[PDB]
Amino acid sequence: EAADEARRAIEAALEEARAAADEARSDSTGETVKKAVDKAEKAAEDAFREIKQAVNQAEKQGASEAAFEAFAAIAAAAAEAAAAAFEAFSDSTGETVAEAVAKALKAAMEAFAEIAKAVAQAAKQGASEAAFEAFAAIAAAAAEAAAAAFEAFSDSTGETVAEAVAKALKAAMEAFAEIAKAVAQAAKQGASEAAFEAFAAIAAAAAEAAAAAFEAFSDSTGETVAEAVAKALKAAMEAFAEIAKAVAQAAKQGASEAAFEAFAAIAAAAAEAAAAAFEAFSDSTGETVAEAVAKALKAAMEAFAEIAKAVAQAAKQGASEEAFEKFAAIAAEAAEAAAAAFERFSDSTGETEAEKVAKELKQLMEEFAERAKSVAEQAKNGAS
Numbered sequence: 275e276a277a278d279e280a281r282r283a284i285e286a287a288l289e290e291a292r293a294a295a296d297e298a299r300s301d302s303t304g305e306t307v308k309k310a311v312d313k314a315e316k317a318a319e320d321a322f323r324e325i326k327q328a329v330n331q332a333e334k335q336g337a338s339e340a341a342f343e344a345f346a347a348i349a350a351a352a353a354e355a356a357a358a359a360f361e362a363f364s365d366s367t368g369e370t371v372a373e374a375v376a377k378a379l380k381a382a383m384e385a386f387a388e389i390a391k392a393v394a395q396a397a398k399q400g401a402s403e404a405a406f407e408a409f410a411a412i413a414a415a416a417a418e419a420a421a422a423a424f425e426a427f428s429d430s431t432g433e434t435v436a437e438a439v440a441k442a443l444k445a446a447m448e449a450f451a452e453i454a455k456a457v458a459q460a461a462k463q464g465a466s467e468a469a470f471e472a473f474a475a476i477a478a479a480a481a482e483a484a485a486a487a488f489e490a491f492s493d494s495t496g497e498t499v500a501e502a503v504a505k506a507l508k509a510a511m512e513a514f515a516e517i518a519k520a521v522a523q524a525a526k527q528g529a530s531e532a533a534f535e536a537f538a539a540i541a542a543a544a545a546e547a548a549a550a551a552f553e554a555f556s557d558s559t560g561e562t563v564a565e566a567v568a569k570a571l572k573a574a575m576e577a578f579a580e581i582a583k584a585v586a587q588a589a590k591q592g593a594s595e596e597a598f599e600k601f602a603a604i605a606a607e608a609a610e611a612a613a614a615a616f617e618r619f620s621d622s623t624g625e626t627e628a629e630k631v632a633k634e635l636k637q638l639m640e641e642f643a644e645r646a647k648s649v650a651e652q653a654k655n656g657a658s
Contacts, residue, residue, distance in 0.1 A: 277333045280342035281326055287349035288322035291315075294357035298364055306369040310376035311360075317380035318356045324387035325349050328394040337397030340406035344393055347410035351417035352386045355379070358417070362424030366431050374436035375427070378443040382420040385447035389413055392454040401461030404470035408457055411474035416450045419443070419484040426488035434497035438504035439488075445504070446484045449511035453477060456522035465525030472521060472534035472541075479541035480514045483507070483548035490552035498561040503552070506568040510548045513575035517541055520586040529589035536585055536598035536605075543605035544578040547571075547612035554616030562625035566632035567616070570639075573632075574612045577639040581605055581646040593653035600649050608642045611635070 295315040302308060329345050359379035363372065393409050423443040427436060457473050487507040491500065521537050551571045555564065585601040615635045619628060 276339040283346035284349045287353040290353035291356040298360035310372035314376035314379040321383035321387040328390040332397035335398040340403040344406045344409040348413040358421035370433040374440040378440040381444035388451040389454040392458040395458040396461030399462040404467035408470035408473040412477040415477035415481040419481045422485035438500040442504040442507045445508040445511045449515045452515040453518040456518040460522040460525035463526040468531040468534040472538040475538035476541040479545040482545040486549035502564040502568040506571040509572040509575035516579040517582040524586040524589035527590040532598040533589045536602040539602035540605040543609040547609040550613035557620040563628040566628035570635040573636040573639040580643040584646045584650040588653040591654040597653040
């Protein structure tokens with residue numbers, strides 16, 4: 275009766291979303307408003323039908339009852355994210371605003387369906403209940419970021435502002451889907467519960483940086499600033515995705531607990547640096563300063579991905595605990611440097627000073643990645 279309670283809860287979430295689609299629809303009369311709402315309402319339904327199917331695919335493969343409790347936790351977060359893409363819609367009724375609203379709700383829905391299928395894959399691969407708790411945490415983090423993207427949208431109605439908002443919400447969604455897939459691969463590879471705890475922290479660290487970039491967007495509706503915010507959030511998302519994949523490869527290698535701890539600290543160091551580059555953007559609405567900001571965050575999203583790929587290569591070699599600590603200390607030292615290049619830029623918005631501090635953050639990022647790679651190659655030889 276466990277999968278039965280899951281299907282009924284799944285049908286309570288789909289129903290709670292259609293009512294939310296109706297709750298936003300009674301307060302709208304423009305034709306383009308009802309169009310995109312019917313588009314957004316059809317996107318959460320094809321995702322709701324895809325959730326009951328994964329609840330049935332793990333029934334033929336009779337998963338543990340922890341898989342059905344994560345499917346109900348994922349359906350519930352699905353209903354809340356549609357009601358969030360609709361609560362932000364309630365303050366708007368323009369064509370492009372509703373269009374990007376439908377696009378963003380379709381982005382978190384396709385990401386939600388992909389998470390349930392990954393939960394189903396681990397079910398046939400009979401994972402641990404720590405993977406299920408990480409699945410509910412990854413789904414909860416997904417809802418917190420889509421809702422934050424909508425709240426930031428509640429402050430803006432610009433066509434380009436809403437377009438980059440939908441482009442950004444899809445970026446973390448595609449990043450979140452890739453995280454759930456890696457969680458499924460390690461589930462087939464039956465890794466530890468320290469990996470799933472770091473996976474929950476990685477899902478949270480993603481939400482922190484996404485909400486921060488949106489919080490920075492709550493200060494700017496200039497098309498040049500919105501795209502820079504969107505392209506930046508995409509960089510950190512592509513970074514976090516690579517960090518989740520690396521967290522799975524060492525899980526295939528079956529490493530120690532200190533690795534996932536440094537992986538959870540690396541995801542946090544990424545969040546701190548991403549929010550910092552956004553917090554300095556809260557003091558700059560010039561085009562050239564905005565580009566230098568997002569370009570450095572791209573250089574920082576590349577650096578963090580390298581330091582996570584390096585910590586994984588030492589876990590495959592079976593290294594000591596001093597490596598993951600030095601890896602986490604390089605991640606935080608990188609965060610202090612990317613935050614410093616942002617607060618000092620808050621005292622210079624001339625194009626020359628912006629691209630100058632940016633290029634130095636790329637030179638230092640390549641140096642930090644060189645420092646992380648040096649730490650890895652030293653641990654492979656058996657260093658004391």
